[PDB]
Symmetry: D2
Subunit: 122 residues, 4 copies
């Protein structure tokens, strides 16, 4: 429970994630709101025995932007924490790297944040 | 091939990973050499068909810092690219997130970089 | 209008800043609203001829967390952009490096994000 | 106390910087080994009473990529620590932001690292 299920960020993006008993996160990422080729494999890990003091649950997952149809030659990883209950939400920061020449290494990695909630937004 | 194998970073951390045809990354991590008290589960994704024009192969992976010995209440994700050849390496940046309370949420995430080689460092 | 003035983020921090003619940012950052021993010097840079296509105004500044009464032995740099208009704001990502040692250098840099508006939260 | 002076990274970029006794950092950056058009104002802050326990000296500075010649509608912030001695060096992580539209704001900011030494490498 808790992590398992559908999450939406505040810009029309989805991922259905199942959380395993050991600490696994596997699922998909529907980069577009719906369509079977904006969909990408997702896998990750989470603190499957988190503090009880009212801290968040630490987690991260990875998606590589290749599927059956498309390749961005790149990948994103999210790192953050899960908060349950009233405003259940996943707070993250993310890195998105592209394969580059050595020459372009330096401009290879974008950084950002993102918040997913259990209820779609506007 | 290439990616599958054992990897070392400047600080003597190690990880043994398997790269699957799909795009799966599966192995373990160790943040303190010698001992298996720092053996944690790694799962990830990589670009199973990258752009042969000389660019790196994009990938990322996650490690939840909980195993059967200790629990850290935090996870790390690595974003980066793999390069093979005589100087084979994985160059990454990473986010380390600790579960916190609303209060310390601003102190939740560590950022860094990491270069992994097939050869143990001095 | 523009950048020059008073800004607020969600957590009760303010800075007052003057946007110099040729590209300077100078001012003070108060981490606690109405608290004297929490003012620190701010210095920065911004794009003084930003585009005319809707884009934001690139900017960044720095605070070394040392003043008259306190010294954290650390520093933050904010990088982001300014948007004027009805919903004026400065969207930022920040890095916070503390002085560490060789050994502990890995755990030296906090990463995050922040948004300042001309009009207080609640 | 030896922050002021000339600094190099491996991609043949320099900055010259003067560190006042008030926490100020003023200087020039020059992404080209030589070349007036490649010069940009630099301004920052550092910790002017750093601990003497073997920790680096925390600092950061900003550069807005507009000068008397060019405008890149962006700015970099570097955050990091000065390490003196004979292996003297400034270890940083940086954030590069361009002015984007709200639409492209997600790919606004690059991340990376950089090391500077008082001596040009390879």
């Amino acid at each position: 429970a808790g992590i398992t299920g559908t999450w939406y960020n505040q810009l029309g993006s989805t991922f259905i994630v199942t959380a395993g008993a050991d600490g696994a996160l596997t699922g998909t990422y529907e980069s577009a709101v719906g369509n079977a080729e904006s969909r990408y494999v997702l896998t990750g890990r989470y603190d499957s025995a988190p503090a009880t003091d009212g801290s968040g649950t630490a987690l991260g997952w990875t998606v590589a932007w290749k599927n059956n149809y498309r390749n961005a030659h790149s990948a994103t990883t999210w790192s953050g924490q899960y908060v349950g209950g009233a405003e259940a939400r996943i707070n993250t920061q993310w890195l998105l790297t592209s394969g580059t020449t050595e020459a372009n290494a330096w401009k290879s990695t974008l950084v950002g944040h993102d918040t997913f909630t259990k209820v779609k937004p506007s």
